[PDB]
Amino acid sequence: SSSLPSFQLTNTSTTYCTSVTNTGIYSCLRTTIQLKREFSFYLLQLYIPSCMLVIVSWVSFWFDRTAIPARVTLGVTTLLTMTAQSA
């Protein structure tokens, strides 16, 4: 688990997968590990920064309606950045 940083090995199972083929019936075992993706990364590199990006788009609601350049610059920049991050 220490050499597996990105996931968390939650459960394992030991089963049989014997199957019938055209050349005959072959005995078969199957071991199965269950990997749960770590969330800390995606919280910090995706969710948090996107909220922070969406929240920025709101601070333009507090700029006077006359200064529209400021509003557009915010709304547009956050939108572009949103795209980049997703890419």
Partner: protein, 79 residues
């Protein structure tokens, strides 16, 4: 860029604390712009000079706070 050369982990790295903080100082700068500009266009001169006051305070408070942060940060992770 930095986070791209790293494996997704389950803990908060010291790098994260430093990026996140600088992120905030810039976010609050924007917030300040809005606050200042909003109370500025208010008809009364009562708010107008308050608007001026916020800038004066910010011009010093921000650097000071950022300096304080650096001190706390480096003492905590430079050890």
């Amino acid at each position: 860029g930095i986070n791209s050369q790293l494996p997704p982990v389950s803990y908060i790295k010291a790098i994260d604390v430093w990026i996140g903080a600088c992120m905030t100082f810039i976010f609050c700068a924007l917030l300040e712009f809005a606050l200042v500009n909003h109370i500025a266009n208010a008809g009364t001169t009562e708010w107008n000079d308050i608007s001026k006051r916020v800038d004066l305070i910010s011009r010093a408070l921000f650097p000071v706070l950022f300096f304080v942060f650096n001190i706390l940060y480096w003492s905590r992770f430079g050890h």
